[PDB]
Design a protein around this ligand. Structure first.
Ligand SMILES: [Ca+2]
Ligand SMILES: [Ca+2]
Ligand SMILES: [Ca+2]
Ligand SMILES: [Ca+2]
Ligand SMILES: [Ca+2]
Ligand SMILES: [Ca+2]
Ligand SMILES: [Ca+2]
Ligand SMILES: [Ca+2]
Ligand SMILES: [Cl-]
Ligand SMILES: [Cl-]
Ligand SMILES: [Cl-]
Ligand SMILES: [Cl-]
Lengths: 362, 362, 362, 363
């Protein structure tokens, strides 16, 4: 029996560890039981966002000191997934996952379970291609076993951090005689997100393997996962996976549920995800621990038939706009802008939409 | 008796007059009866946004050929208020106000009424100061009379276009030995917006004159109008005013209602403005002609106690972010992102909030 | 006897026609003799830059009334070539090319001359391929004849407006069951610019015909023109070619010379272009009429072995940065940032460089 | 005992990249205990929300702490870390590492490179942009001069400073204590902190008389400026860190520093003059450059040599980003290398629209 506790912690800057330290110093968190930290950091969330790496370095430094181990050991032990971009009213914060073994009686209900797995590092020419899909799928299965979830229907959110391309890395690949999937560094984020998402879909049985090929990645939007949430960053060269679902072997006082936003203003889907996590009315919103969602600009350039400029705006990249919009929609339903919204939902929900999960107290 | 008709028209680009031309060619709009056009244009909505002037030039040129008068005569006759910034999912469009005297009977109930007034041009050193406040107040009272509205309680939205400062204008003021209200081009938009808004509050009796001074402008956030909506532009040197309310002397089949968003995620206020316009349920949402709202970053840097980076972000100006947020919130309630949202709400609703009006079919 | 006059005119805004009006009112410019207007407009010079069309509309309106013809016809009579993006210290301005016939003898030598020619309309499947390269080469040789320029070594600047692919133009090629060179409209602008530039290089003997194939277009960057300056347009279906050079049979009081910037900080090329235009010392800089250059971010992500962030910067489009740098380098040599630096330099100078022409008084 | 300053300009791959510094320490070329200052160009936006500055300092402090066997806190008390964000245009991210060795050699003939470092006390938020910051910076500049063994302020050629800014939380702290701040805006507070710090340099070096400086002059009287001050603001510190760089008759350095002042953003003549002042008389001698260090800014007039630009009107790109791109490009066009230090925002640093420019060169 394992019990998962989840702490959503406001942050003052990317390197702010004070909220986590307060929970450790008060005895609410044993640092040795932390298994994953999922952050919203306030950089631009795109290629040249160094707040993600700054936040991970700061958390790993702090935990290494608290645990008496090296930073390298902390990064091998704990998943650090930092999603940049806190546009609009979205509030920077970290969500800390704590897992402990407990001797507790079995109960009929399934309760929150979390699992973690890491892939090998990828060469730049593997991003957005079948090697990334297949390695991610293996890691997702590994993380499910870590979460003691055997039925993929009980997986409600699979959070992934994945790499991207920079000009220097594209040049390194070229020197080795290799072509990368795309030469635009911003677009490279989409291919890494999309290949990683398809790996989730493959692992969970949402899509059969014979449908996935290099040619389909970031092209066939009818191929998608309903629970994958992927996020790209300059600060890592592999994929990190957090599987979140419900398990019969869990003693948690939390559950997770989810829905899929059909488009960026689909407040009905927010309410559906809340209801799936056991929150039946506005009066029960106080049981939210966090809301986690993917947002994107639709390839059509429209929302319910209405044109917008997200794909056209050379001044502001579209994943920034999408995060602002979907965080605002969620905030207006739950009354709190301190929720997790990540942009770029290639093969995550339909084109223009994305998965949305809610972790709630029972 | 005056009859007011309002046409919300999607646009393909700032210079797109095709939707208006279709309505004119079909006889649905007599172009001599246009009194005002309120646009959302897809520039950045800040200082160097030339889509506002591009849209006005294109409309004035089109109408001048249709009316057989000069472009200069068109701009003397018709209010052209172009609000730039179509961030997030906000859809570019124009709202065309048609007004005509009619021989019609007096039916019980007040109906939509519209009035228009222009101020004199301002020197750069008059923006953000009492000269602009007092001259705007005079014009608002004049526009109320044009609308045949006696009671300020029947005024529901006062839309204003006002000037700003460029570097060249500031330097010229310096050469003339005059100090401007602020030496920052972007911040001059806030002072022009704020002084114009206080001109509205003064005219409508929302604030007594003895509380307004140069020192209060963009400083005393307890002073605000609940119906003022102001928008700044490089493309004009005066203020243009549209007063919108309801009158006993209106033969319109439309009504306007309003509320005030207490902050950027106040969906309750959107529903309240809908109800005030006679839209009592989701099934009646199709009676919306348009929704018009002001949005802004709160000076505290927070929403409901939660930090955001709108005031810190040197890459994206905060009025851009506020527009994306509040449009998304409105879009999630009414199911349509083609609504008017303008950013920067100094003395327009409380600090961090802004007025929101709904024009609806009866 | 051909005589070309060239007027570089500072502008206060995209719609500012006052400087051109002053020259027409004084009689220095007969508007019927204007053949082309090359503009630097202060929008972002990227996808959503409406200052280009705003400037053209304002000039077309003003000239339409001076010439007594419609705006549609003046746009066919005069080549309006608007390059957005005035980053760094680059000063917005327009350059007006006047072509007239004079009763004078030939100046003792070679003097400025312009020639114009047009290709056939290109089917969508032909854009960015040998059909466009070969047809442009033909039209360049015709424009040289029109300019009375026999030696291709006397051609120093070839402005080309070339087409692009749209969704319907691609859906027309697939309706005919054909394949276009690339699927998206944006990348098609690169292929159109590049094929047009190689057509110049082929027409002038800058490269050998047997080096150009479909496979080499936008691939073999060792192939390039030293004088071509190409830009894509949404309206035209063919290539509009303007050859600028020096003819033995000209009465112009101006000459043109050029060089090629090897990279973005090649001040040596700026000085060499000045010297080719007959400016031999700092004391003769006031003879410059304009400098016309292309800027480009090097695909390697490095300049003279030094990394930069242009291709990794998600906040600022790399073409904006390249224009700022190249303008500043030229300004550091000539003491004047009011020069024409444009982007989109495929096969125009080497990768990361671009042509640079100087028009000077004799 | 004899000071010998060595200066290493090291390309970086990212803000947290310590590899080039590590290569020099591992080879024995740098004794890490002799590092006195590191001046960085980091590739964030160089404006308010640039966290590459703190990321770079944290990464260097954690690396050096481990090499020296001391805590990160001790490293930051011993070594100046001045990270200037913003690497626009072709400007190449890099760090410049100042090493002060104690050598068993006489002083070299004449005057050779000398460096001194001093830290001010922390400033209360209501002191930024005001005389308290000016006077305290002036005291620190005089202390750093004596650390450098530079007697004559004419032999100071560049004074590099990192200074604080106002956050919303610091403004609220001041208000809770009954104090008002110089300006209620973080971005503008950077200008005031930069400008007051630069006037402290001017006062310490005798470039401006004390009776010309008052709170009302700061960021208003642009006729008042230092010709060697270079100041840079950020969120990660509450004091000013000062590096004085000049030439001393008590130095064994194989380097010298010279400077000029750019009158405007395209003043290549000033770049050449700074080169000549550092002993570089011809183009072939450019290979003697160790680094070029300069301040850039958008002129308040909105023009350069009578020509309008959009820097101050451009709401998409802050003007300090544009100024850095321009002045780096101008310097790179002269010296053939974009890996030079250019910092934006030059209040009371050279005239309005210009800024000091210094060259460290091998002899
Ligand atoms: Ca159970
Ligand atoms: Ca999706
Ligand atoms: Ca009635
Ligand atoms: Ca800004
Ligand atoms: Ca307000
Ligand atoms: Ca090129
Ligand atoms: Ca803060
Ligand atoms: Ca200065
Ligand atoms: Cl919905
Ligand atoms: Cl008055
Ligand atoms: Cl480019
Ligand atoms: Cl110069």
């Amino acid at each position: 029996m394992q019990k998962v506790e989840v702490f959503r912690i406001p942050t003052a800057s990317p390197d702010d560890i004070s909220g986590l330290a307060t929970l450790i110093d008060s005895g609410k968190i044993n640092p040795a039981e932390i298994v994953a930290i999922l952050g919203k950091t306030e950089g631009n969330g795109c290629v040249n966002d160094f707040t993600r790496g700054f936040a991970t370095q700061s958390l790993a430094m702090y935990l290494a000191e608290k645990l008496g181990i090296s930073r390298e050991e902390v990064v091998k032990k704990v998943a650090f997934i930092m999603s940049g971009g806190t546009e609009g009213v979205m509030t920077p914060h970290i969500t800390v996952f704590v897992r402990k073994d407990v001797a507790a009686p079995a109960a009929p209900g399934k309760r929150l379970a979390v699992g973690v797995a890491f892939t090998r590092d990828f060469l730049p020419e593997e991003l957005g291609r079948m090697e990334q899909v297949n390695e991610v799928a293996r890691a997702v299965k590994e993380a499910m076993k870590d979460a003691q979830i055997d039925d993929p229907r009980d997986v409600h959110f699979v959070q992934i951090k994945c790499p991207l391309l920079t000009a220097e890395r594209i040049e390194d690949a070229k020197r080795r005689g290799k072509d990368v999937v795309v030469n635009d560094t911003y677009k490279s984020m989409a291919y890494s997100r999309g290949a990683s998402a398809l790996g989730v879909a493959l692992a969970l049985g949402e899509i059969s393997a014979d449908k996935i090929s290099n040619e389909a990645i970031c092209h066939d939007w009818n191929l998608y996962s309903s629970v994958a949430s992927t996020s790209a960053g300059v600060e890592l060269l592999n994929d990190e996976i957090i599987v979140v679902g419900n398990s019969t072997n869990s003693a948690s006082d939390l559950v997770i549920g989810h829905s899929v936003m059909k488009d960026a203003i689909d407040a009905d889907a927010v309410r559906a995800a809340l209801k799936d996590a056991g929150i039946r009315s506005d009066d029960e919103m106080d049981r939210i621990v966090n809301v986690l969602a993917k947002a994107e600009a639709a390839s059509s350039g429209t929302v319910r038939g209405r044109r917008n400029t997200m794909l056209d705006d050379s001044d502001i990249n579209h994943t920034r706009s999408a995060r602002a919009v979907v965080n605002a929609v969620i905030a207006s339903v739950v009354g709190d802008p301190m929720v997790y919204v990540s942009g770029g939902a290639e093969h995550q929900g339909p084109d223009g939409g994305g998965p949305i999960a809610v972790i709630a107290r029972v």
